[PDB]
Amino acid sequence: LTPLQQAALKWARKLAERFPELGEEFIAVHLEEARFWEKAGATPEEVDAAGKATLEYYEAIRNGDEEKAVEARKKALDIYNKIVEALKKQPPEVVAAYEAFRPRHEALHRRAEATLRAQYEARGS
Numbered sequence: 001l002t003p004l005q006q007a008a009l010k011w012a013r014k015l016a017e018r019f020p021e022l023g024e025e026f027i028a029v030h031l032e033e034a035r036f037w038e039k040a041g042a043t044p045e046e047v048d049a050a051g052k053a054t055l056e057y058y059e060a061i062r063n064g065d066e067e068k069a070v071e072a073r074k075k076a077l078d079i080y081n082k083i084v085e086a087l088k089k090q091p092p093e094v095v096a097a098y099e100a101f102r103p104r105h106e107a108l109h110r111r112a113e114a115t116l117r118a119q120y121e122a123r124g125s
């Protein structure tokens with residue numbers, strides 16, 4: 001267990017615990033994403049800051065806080081953009097592997113956004 005994997009595990013487990021509908025699948029998908037971040041040369045602190053902003057982002061959707069959602073989304077994607085451009089210099093098998101994995105992360109992301117917005121519209125928070 002690398003320090004980068006531990007950093008991704010900490011924030012992905014928090015999201016799964018607070019929103020059980022996402023489930024352990026939310027943790028596993030974010031670990032696989034973290035393996036590509038590690039391949040691209042990301043550091044544990046970059047993954048820790050991005051995971052922290054991701055929890056704040058989804059917590060913002062659950063609570064209807066739009067300003068916090070905008071700020072948290074930018075903080076997470078500022079770090080993600082650094083890693084997309086680093087992935088360009090990766091071997092083609094790594095890039096092709098990432099392009100084949102990303103639709104599964106996209107589908108979990110679409111589900112998580114809709115499910116938490118639904119909890120704000122119904123439960124209210």
Ligand SMILES: [Zn+2]
Nearest residue numbers: 030105108109
């Ligand atoms: Zn995600």
Ligand SMILES: [Zn+2]
Nearest residue numbers: 106109110113
């Ligand atoms: Zn989105």
